[PDB]
Amino acid sequence: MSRLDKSKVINSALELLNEVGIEGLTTRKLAQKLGVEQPTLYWHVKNKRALLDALAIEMLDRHHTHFSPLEGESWQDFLRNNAKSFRNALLSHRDGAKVHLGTRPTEKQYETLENQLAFLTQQGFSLENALYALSAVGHFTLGSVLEDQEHQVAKEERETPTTDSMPPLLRQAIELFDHQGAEPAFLHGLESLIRGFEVQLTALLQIV
Amino acid sequence: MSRLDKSKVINSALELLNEVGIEGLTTRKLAQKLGVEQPTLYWHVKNKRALLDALAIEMLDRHHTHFSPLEGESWQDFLRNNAKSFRNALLSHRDGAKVHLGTRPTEKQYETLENQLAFLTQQGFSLENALYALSAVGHFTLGSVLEDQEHQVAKEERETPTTDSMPPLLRQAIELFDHQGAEPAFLHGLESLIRGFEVQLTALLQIV
Amino acid sequence: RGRWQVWGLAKRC
Amino acid sequence: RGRWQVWGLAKRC
């Protein structure tokens, strides 16, 4: 209970998560890793679900640090930096995005939602459009990360066809994604969404 | 083996999937539902993983019917209709999107990828931008559906705070999403992405 | 219905 | 690395 300080159980869980993925993670494997009996760990942590909720929240604490607008930030810059920040959280551990999936939102998060809307609307968005914008940026980001993370968890047993059986376009696509990874695609898409809203908001009174 | 025709095992699995979700789905529960011994079912279906691959593909066969460009369709219309179609597939069964997650792509799908690129590039996209566009529309769509589907699988035990403890913006947001559901947000975001690429492609030789 | 959408959004903050 | 991205994209067809 130094061994079982909340912050040490959290760190152990994170390291386990990286070792075995969300699949493998069990309260049992945590008990062995910490070197304690299962009922001792059960006093602190009821089940796999309660443990994930804590992992989800921790990841967001450490890394999702741009969750509100900086003093006189434009809404475009805010949306962009908030999406990047949320993404750094999801990526910070193996299966980050699945861990995040289905965990309840905390009270401070609701409050943050509220401010995020106050801000956007004070920049001239209708409430409808503010919600559509935060929603789209979030889906896009979440979707980016599940795919990227599904890769190296499917990397183990399955494999791709060899690079040289491919039709020639697909073959240049491999070269290209080899060189850049996935960050540039994410950034490009983020930037297209934000541009598309910009054309949206410039609509204001009429047709586009 | 009328009871165990491939198409009857598939339909049974789909119905089971709706009853218990991806979590609950086991080859064992399938054996009981079909009324056969587990080793008889095991002759046809090796494991949970092989079964999901078949469910993923079936869903896409039945519903993802707009996977290539219609005779003289514009690329905007194509992107839009393809995203909608992929989405109808994911939504067609409980946990559709998770089922889809990690399943290998079939040979015809690679071939379809290739045509989709041939088309976009023949409409004046660079190969880089064609890939960024298909990628963003896909992430966004996948992300939309996991969230929408996570809801009614978390609906069971957990509940939201009551509508009347909310700050007033959040409270109008509830009204609004009550009335429209989630389709309109998806359509709006799809349409913003596509607009954002449009500003992209109009760049062509210069700065935007 | 509406309560769950706002739940989704609040989750990303 | 590249092989997996195209795998992702092909999956959605």
Swiss-Prot record, chains A, B:
Record-listed Mg(2+) binding positions: 100
**What task does this protein carry out?**
TetR is the repressor of the tetracycline resistance element; its N-terminal region forms a helix-turn-helix structure and binds DNA. Binding of tetracycline to TetR reduces the repressor affinity for the tetracycline resistance gene (tetA) promoter operator sites.
Look up the signal peptide feature and give its range: none
Tell me a GO biological process for this protein.
negative regulation of DNA-templated transcription
* Record-listed tetracycline binding positions: 64, 82
Q: Which UniProt keywords apply?
A: Antibiotic resistance, DNA-binding, Magnesium, Metal-binding, Repressor, Transcription, Transcription regulation, Transposable element
Q: Which organism is it from?
A: Escherichia coli
Gene3D superfamilies this protein is in? Homeodomain-like, Tetracycline Repressor, domain 2
Q: Which GO terms describe its molecular function?
A: DNA-binding transcription factor activity; metal ion binding; transcription cis-regulatory region binding
Domain HTH tetR-type stretches: 3-63
Checking SUPFAM superfamilies in the record gives:
Homeodomain-like, Tetracyclin repressor-like, C-terminal domain
Under what name is this protein listed? Tetracycline repressor protein class B from transposon Tn10
Which gene holds the coding sequence for this protein? Answer: tetR
Residues annotated as DNA-binding are 26-45
